[PDB]
Design a protein around this ligand. Structure first.
Ligand SMILES: [Cl-]
Ligand SMILES: [Cl-]
Ligand SMILES: [Cl-]
Ligand SMILES: [Cl-]
Ligand SMILES: [K+]
Ligand SMILES: [Mg+2]
Ligand SMILES: [Mg+2]
Ligand SMILES: [Mg+2]
Ligand SMILES: [Mg+2]
Ligand SMILES: [Mg+2]
Ligand SMILES: [Mg+2]
Ligand SMILES: [Mg+2]
Ligand SMILES: [Mg+2]
Ligand SMILES: [Mg+2]
Ligand SMILES: [Mg+2]
Ligand SMILES: [Mg+2]
Ligand SMILES: [Mg+2]
Ligand code: NA
Ligand code: NA
Ligand code: NA
Ligand code: NA
Ligand code: NA
Ligand code: NA
Ligand code: NA
Ligand code: NA
Ligand code: NA
Ligand code: NA
Ligand code: NA
Ligand code: NA
Ligand code: NA
Lengths: 145, 92, 194
RNA sequence: GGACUGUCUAGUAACAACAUAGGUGACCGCAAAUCCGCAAGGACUCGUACGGUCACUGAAUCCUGCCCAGUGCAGGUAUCUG
RNA sequence: ACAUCUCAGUAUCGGGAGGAACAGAAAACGCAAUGUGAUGUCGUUAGUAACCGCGAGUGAACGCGAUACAGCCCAAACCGA
């Protein structure tokens, strides 16, 4: 039995005095009315902030953390088993409509990996060379200067 | 109140105390080419023109100090918080 | 070599210069004394006519139509209106003078259909255009592989529905890309927003 | 009290209210002044200053003083503003 | 409260076509490309970009997945009844 189904006989259906549930006055105005006066509480302040750049000048990067790669190496049997080597561009999902692929250094690297990507970070590098591994920058990756 | 035209104080640019010269900020002219100037033309037409139909506000009994502190050596200026003053006159 | 037609065209690039200038000064005097719709035997600008569809044939008609210059002839509000809608003077109509002339002509010839039109000048208070009309019932046209299409039922009263050339342009259908989001495939379908 | 005959709140007001002749000022020579229309056009007007428009006062009799600073209208205007 | 805004290009008014109308073979797009390739419409893009007493509110498109697919004729040049 629902709350609704128990209202017959209550007269007010939970509204308190029958002088309550009338029009927009019981709401303090239609929609967002009074967002700076009587109902300013818990409303983001009035104002203009910052600027936007034209969408066709914006770039969307494809990210991936080392932890993800390293945790699935033994399962990624369909990828080169060097002295491990994996072209990152083939691992990441959503790599089609992306401007490039970048490897981030989050997590551990318990293997000797030879990574191929368009861009890396310090932590990504240090952790790969920390496990006696290399990092190979792609031709697109040659855009660093 | 009176105020010395030149005195020693911290220059946030050199990062060491130096002699600054005090001047009153003059109003820079309007180019009339900012976004607000364009919206006035676009949005104004037949009948009332919203905000662009309003007229100048009013006046406070006393305005704060609008000054420019210029460093004697590096020559750059910095701004400071003002204080209500009925009149300001520099000494020398 | 240049066609003889290319010369009529060139003179009309500058209706204020040369002989055409003197010609226009003379003509308009007789024009101002004529009606609103005057059927004429030969087009004033041969090159433009033929370019638009004209043909020296049975069932092809032409008519000069004068319309007044200026904005809308509107009556001031008689009941309550917010300031935005109390205008009279700066209000103009959304249909252009050339499209107005085309209509006043098609009504004079209730059996014919508008093919196209062009401008033939104006003075200080009126504009003249020459509409080209076609008899959809004459067999000379019904067998013309160039003009027969204007015989179909769906071409009936084509001017009043904006299917004319000047019509389609005034409806903002020129551009095929940017700026034509609310105009194509029709103004009415896009909630009337252009 | 209103000069008089006259008009009015169909349905709580018939009056001292409105009208009136009479007095006064204003605008206009007619392609006018005043007014109607979005326009095409129209009333006044088959009229022309002894006219007709726009107002005030309100028969007759005796009269109708002073003020142009403010507001209004109108004319002029070196110079200022525009 | 209210004047821009909103209700809405809605109600209502004038004119007109059909069995469907309108649109339509780029002076296009601009995931900028070594790329797409007429038009409607459906799903999505997205309440995103953009508007706005920058208040309340308002509000696309390119692309994509589908449906269905189809491209052609003049004016002129050169001929001249
Ligand atoms: Cl941005
Ligand atoms: Cl100051
Ligand atoms: Cl027609
Ligand atoms: Cl594309
Ligand atoms: K309103
Ligand atoms: Mg205005
Ligand atoms: Mg449609
Ligand atoms: Mg009486
Ligand atoms: Mg009574
Ligand atoms: Mg009585
Ligand atoms: Mg009685
Ligand atoms: Mg009386
Ligand atoms: Mg009198
Ligand atoms: Mg009199
Ligand atoms: Mg809207
Ligand atoms: Mg408000
Ligand atoms: Mg686009
Ligand atoms: Na409750
Ligand atoms: Na109630
Ligand atoms: Na509320
Ligand atoms: Na407030
Ligand atoms: Na894509
Ligand atoms: Na605009
Ligand atoms: Na017709
Ligand atoms: Na528009
Ligand atoms: Na009597
Ligand atoms: Na006075
Ligand atoms: Na005076
Ligand atoms: Na109110
Ligand atoms: Na607004």
């Amino acid at each position: 039995t629902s709350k609704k189904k128990r209202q017959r006989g209550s007269r007010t259906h939970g509204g308190g005095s029958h002088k309550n549930r009338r029009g927009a006055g019981h709401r303090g105005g239609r929609g967002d009315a009074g967002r700076d006066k009587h109902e300013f509480h818990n409303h983001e302040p009035l104002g203009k902030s910052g600027f936007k750049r034209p969408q066709k000048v914006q770039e969307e990067a494809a990210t991936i953390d080392v932890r993800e790669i390293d945790e699935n190496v033994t399962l990624l049997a369909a990828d080169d088993v060097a002295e491990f080597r994996v072209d990152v561009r083939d691992v990441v999902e959503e790599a089609d409509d992306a401007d490039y692929v970048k490897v981030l250094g989050a997590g551990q690297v318990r293997h000797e990996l030879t990574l191929i990507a368009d861009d890396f970070s310090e932590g990504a590098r240090e952790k790969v060379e920390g496990a006696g591994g290399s990092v190979e920058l792609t031709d697109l990756g040659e855009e660093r200067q | 109140m009176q105020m010395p035209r030149r005195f020693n104080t911290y220059c946030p640019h050199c990062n060491e105390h130096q002699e600054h010269e005090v001047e009153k900020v003059r109003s820079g002219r309007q180019t009339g080419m900012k976004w607000i100037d364009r919206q006035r033309e676009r949005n104004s037409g037949i009948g009332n023109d919203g905000k662009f139909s309003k007229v100048p506000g009013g006046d406070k009994p006393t305005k704060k100090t609008d000054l420019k502190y210029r460093c004697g050596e590096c020559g750059k200026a910095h701004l400071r918080e003002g204080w209500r003053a009925g009149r300001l006159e520099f000494q020398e | 070599a240049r066609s003889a037609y290319s010369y009529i065209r060139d003179a009309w690039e500058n209706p204020g210069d040369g002989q055409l200038a003197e010609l226009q000064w003379q003509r308009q005097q007789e024009w101002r004394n004529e009606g609103a719709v005057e059927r004429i035997e030969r087009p004033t600008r041969l090159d433009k006519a033929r370019s638009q569809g004209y043909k020296a044939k049975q069932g092809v008609i032409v008519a000069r139509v004068s319309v007044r210059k200026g904005s809308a002839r509107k009556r001031r509000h008689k009941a309550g209106r917010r300031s935005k809608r109390q205008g009279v003077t700066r209000i103009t109509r959304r249909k252009d003078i050339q499209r107005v002339a085309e209509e006043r002509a098609s009504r004079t010839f209730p059996n014919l259909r508008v093919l196209n039109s062009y401008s033939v000048g104006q003075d200080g208070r009126q504009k003249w255009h020459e509409v080209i009309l076609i008899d959809p019932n004459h067999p000379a046209i019904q067998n013309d592989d160039d003009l027969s299409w204007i015989c179909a039922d769906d071409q009936a009263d084509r001017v009043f529905r904006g299917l004319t050339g000047a019509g389609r342009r005034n409806r903002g259908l020129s551009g095929k890309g940017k700026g034509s989001e609310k105009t194509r495939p029709s103004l009415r379908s896009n909630g009337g927003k252009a």
